[PDB]
Design an enzyme around this catalytic site. Sequence first.
Site, PDB file in Angstrom:
ATOM      1  N   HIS A 103       0.814  -1.212   0.000  1.00 38.79           N
ATOM      2  CA  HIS A 103       0.000   0.000   0.000  1.00 38.79           C
ATOM      3  C   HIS A 103       0.849   1.264   0.000  1.00 38.79           C
ATOM      4  O   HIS A 103       0.364   2.323  -0.414  1.00 38.79           O
ATOM      5  CB  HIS A 103      -0.949   0.006   1.203  1.00 38.79           C
ATOM      6  CG  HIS A 103      -0.260   0.184   2.522  1.00 38.79           C
ATOM      7  ND1 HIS A 103      -0.020  -0.864   3.383  1.00 38.79           N
ATOM      8  CD2 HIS A 103       0.229   1.290   3.131  1.00 38.79           C
ATOM      9  CE1 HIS A 103       0.591  -0.413   4.465  1.00 38.79           C
ATOM     10  NE2 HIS A 103       0.756   0.891   4.335  1.00 38.79           N
TER      11      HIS A 103
ATOM     12  N   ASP B 105      -0.165  -7.920   2.379  1.00 38.44           N
ATOM     13  CA  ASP B 105       0.462  -6.640   2.072  1.00 38.44           C
ATOM     14  C   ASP B 105       1.945  -6.842   1.791  1.00 38.44           C
ATOM     15  O   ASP B 105       2.793  -6.514   2.627  1.00 38.44           O
ATOM     16  CB  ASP B 105       0.257  -5.656   3.227  1.00 38.44           C
ATOM     17  CG  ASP B 105       0.616  -4.231   2.853  1.00 38.44           C
ATOM     18  OD1 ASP B 105       0.969  -3.988   1.681  1.00 38.44           O
ATOM     19  OD2 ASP B 105       0.541  -3.352   3.736  1.00 38.44           O
TER      20      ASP B 105
ATOM     21  N   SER C 127       4.508   1.907   9.336  1.00 42.30           N
ATOM     22  CA  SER C 127       3.805   0.890   8.567  1.00 42.30           C
ATOM     23  C   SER C 127       4.759   0.210   7.596  1.00 42.30           C
ATOM     24  O   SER C 127       5.611   0.860   6.984  1.00 42.30           O
ATOM     25  CB  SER C 127       2.633   1.515   7.809  1.00 42.30           C
ATOM     26  OG  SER C 127       1.976   0.549   7.006  1.00 42.30           O
TER      27      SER C 127
END
Length: 579
Positions: free
Chosen positions: A363, A419, A525
């Site tokens: 992402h 992810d 992240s």
Amino acid sequence: ANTFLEEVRKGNLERECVEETCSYEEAFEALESSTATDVFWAKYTACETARTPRDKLAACLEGNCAEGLGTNYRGHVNITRSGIECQLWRSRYPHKPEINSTTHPGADLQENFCRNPDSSTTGPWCYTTDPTVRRQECSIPVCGQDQVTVAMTPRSEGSSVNLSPPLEQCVPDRGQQYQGRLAVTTHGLPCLAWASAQAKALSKHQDFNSAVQLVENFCRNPDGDEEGVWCYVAGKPGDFGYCDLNYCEEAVEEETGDGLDEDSDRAIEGRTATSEYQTFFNPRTFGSGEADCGLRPLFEKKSLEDKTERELLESYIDGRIVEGSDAEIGMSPWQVMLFRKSPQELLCGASLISDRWVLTAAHCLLYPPWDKNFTENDLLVRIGKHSRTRYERNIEKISMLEKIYIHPRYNWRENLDRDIALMKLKKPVAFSDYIHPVCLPDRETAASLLQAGYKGRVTGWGNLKETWTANVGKGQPSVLQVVNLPIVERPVCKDSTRIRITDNMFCAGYKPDEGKRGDACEGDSGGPFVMKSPFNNRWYQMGIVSWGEGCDRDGKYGFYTHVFRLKKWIQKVIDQFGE
Ligand SMILES: [Ca+2]
Ligand SMILES: [Ca+2]
Ligand SMILES: [Ca+2]
Ligand SMILES: [Ca+2]
Ligand SMILES: [Ca+2]
Ligand SMILES: [Ca+2]
């Protein structure tokens, strides 16, 4: 305004700025509480069409109905016209609103209560938590009638009656016993015939299972790859694409060991029983020094233990949540900071897996709804950094990305499943104390470590909190920060979210009791989630720190994306570069 001798009598907010066209001065004079003054002003403004009659202005003061396009609505309805959840106006998940709390603070933007900040033609609307659609109009009542602003048709999902229920059993053993004739991929890239010249040339060096027959052009997973059925696709040499199969939920923690005696007291530390590291990847393209994963020369080469290791056992003091603590020097070699090339902006975190390959959240690279679509030439990485805002030339290093691989099973449309993003550096960076790759756990190793009850470690600089939350009050730490988070129960993990959670993502962290929100939104992240293995004195990274409910919603823990099964997949990348 009228009855001139009103300014000598005491006054009534309702006998001046309600039953009469009034000055904001007499309004200001009578209000002083400038917050509610702005509120009353907002009222007046919106009630510009509710100036008359008096009871109309009284209702416009109540605020339960949206006036005109919905600038005034102050109710509690926080649902779209079709039942989709409304996304937080201030938060950037899943879309970064150009029109949000900062731009429209005067509308009293609640948690997710439907509003019309820009006076949009769709009336009172709201951003949607679904990444697929950015915005949706809300069915909010309009003033003057028992009329809603838009049609309310709640989304009923797929029924169990109008469709055909598939009797196909869930595929076990990660497809080592499936030979169906399904011939459609997830991304639509056609499967090259397995008996064709190109597939044979690509697989002559690959030892595919003899039991699983290689049919012409179907999805086949004979190589023992835990990810699923994959096939070669047209394009550049070595291109691969995975097909979707509904595997039974094969949780790693539920693997029952056939050599673990039930004497689970006083866990024995590794003494004269050394578990050697097994090289699953060829050094030629995966990089040299693979045997030295997660071995810090300052700590590991001298058997120096960090001051934060005494908390590893989950038998610690009553499991009270521990605040954030500053990490030592040189204790985070596998952390990578993914930075924007131009202009200057910190983007995300990443994990160092080898001296020539890096692992980062997908992402952070691709998110078309987020106006984020980065190529290989638009982001860089920094390894071995101590302070974000400073530059310590000698000990830290920088690198510029060249090649990016995206796993076809990365599903950002439903729950951000898998992810995963892989990156390659054009100029390799040699080994150092502050830069060193972390070990990769397998299925059995992950099961053994998770059933041992050892806490996980997350390293970062708070960029996850900046990216996925609007919580201002705890500034982004420019210092290397570390948080210890243990694991929780998987069925409770399912019950802890209203959105479906795949087996590739798991819960970790303490349960935040009511009255406070946990620290699950600390760090960056895409960063690592590492545990110091007690069986070989090594650090194993369970996966990637991906987006979880711990940021956007209070009372939640950290959700992490598993990458431990991908060993067979990993070589599949470098098999493309074996030239
Ligand atoms: Ca008057
Ligand atoms: Ca007056
Ligand atoms: Ca009067
Ligand atoms: Ca006055
Ligand atoms: Ca007055
Ligand atoms: Ca009156």
